[PDB]
Design a protein around this ligand. Structure first.
Ligand SMILES: [Ca+2]
Ligand SMILES: [Ca+2]
Ligand SMILES: [Ca+2]
Length: 350
């Protein structure tokens, strides 16, 4: 349990052979599935500094680097469309974490998932801490840049509220952070910890991931019939389902593409613990965080949901006009609107 063990050493990234990946794994407690992992990406010959990116719900560090799940590949990553690869190409040591969710078998159900009952904030925060400690030694930085996507932005802020003084020198929120008072991709099956155990429902399933091969089928066969007869094709149905949820804008700028969206949905982890959301009770102190911050907010999703008032005083807020949630993370226009802007912001800190 104690140590990080190397599992992939100096491995070139598919479609990006100037970039290399290292992966380490750490056993945690107390079930066989309590494992975390850490990915590092840098240019051949080395990168500098340290940026850690926290994935969002059902996401993983693996997804953030190779748009894959357990080595199952759905596409070839484009560094222009990937914050991790883009920052690594531009000279940074970039790291990203596989949460414990990345080790859950997709076929488990109901009470077989009871080992996730205490996958709450102290667990997640402890796992992020182990990664940060490793990064400091690996990169040589006393403090790091911490980025977060969606849920990962809340995680970044929560982590920072506890450890910013010794660990964090800059925050990058990519459509993620505390949401507004009572802000209403699932309808909750449980509403408390007691109900979770009473009903034996410990996780929220993804509508993508290994248990939903529809996305991958539809990328290869986009003109097949729609399961919902309102639409002319399966791809039409799936892309419009993303539109309706504020996840994509297929119809106007930034012109979300199935080639970008379907691989993301396909490569998610199957399950996410209820415990994190059921600990809405826990108060984190965001008042003292004196860290330079850049926050990106999608017009079609984030502005409606995310609360700007609770962020550090520094914060530069970038509104992404036309964007759905997932457009923040992929697509050819994300290079101009997100990735290059994060790089420029980082250059202003140095
Ligand atoms: Ca140092
Ligand atoms: Ca399916
Ligand atoms: Ca077809």
């Amino acid at each position: 349990y104690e140590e990080w063990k190397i599992v992939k050493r100096e491995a070139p990234i598919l479609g990006n052979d100037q970039l290399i990946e290292n992966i380490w794994k750490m056993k945690r407690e107390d079930s066989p599935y309590d494992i975390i992992s850490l990915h590092k990406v840098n240019l051949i010959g080395g990168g500098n500094d340290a940026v850690l990116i926290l994935p969002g719900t059902w996401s993983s560090g693996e997804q953030l680097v190779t748009i894959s799940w357990n080595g199952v590949h759905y596409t070839i990553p484009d560094y222009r469309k990937s914050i991790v690869l883009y920052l690594a190409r531009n000279g940074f040591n970039v790291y990203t974490i596989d949460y414990r969710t990345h080790y859950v078998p997709p076929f488990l159900k109901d009470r077989q998932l009871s080992f996730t009952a205490n996958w709450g904030w102290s667990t997640w925060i402890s796992d992020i801490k182990e990664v940060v400690s490793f990064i400091k030694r690996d990169s040589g930085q006393e403090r790091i840049y911490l980025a977060g996507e969606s849920f990962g932005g809340i995680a970044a802020l929560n982590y920072s509220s506890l450890y910013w003084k010794n660990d964090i020198k800059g925050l990058i929120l990519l459509d993620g952070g505390p949401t507004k008072h009572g802000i209403r991709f699932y309808t909750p099956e449980v509403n408390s910890i007691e109900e979770m155990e009473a009903k034996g429902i410990y996780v929220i399933p993804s509508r993508g991931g290994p248990n939903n091969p529809i996305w991958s089928y539809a990328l290869a066969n986009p003109d097949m019939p729609s399961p919902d007869p309102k639409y002319k094709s399966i791809s039409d149905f799936l892309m419009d389902s993303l539109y309706v949820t504020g996840s994509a804008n297929p119809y106007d700028y930034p012109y979300s593409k199935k080639e970008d969206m379907f691989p993301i949905l396909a490569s998610f982890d199957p399950y996410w613990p209820y415990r994190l959301s059921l600990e809405r009770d826990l108060k984190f102190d965001y008042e003292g965080i004196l860290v330079p911050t850049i926050a990106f907010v999608s017009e079609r999703f984030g502005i409606q949901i995310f609360d700007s008032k609770i962020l550090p005083s520094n914060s530069e807020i970038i509104l992404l006009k036309g964007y759905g949630h997932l457009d923040v993370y992929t697509g050819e226009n994300s290079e101009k609107d997100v990735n290059s802007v994060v790089l420029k912001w980082l250059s202003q800190q140095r």
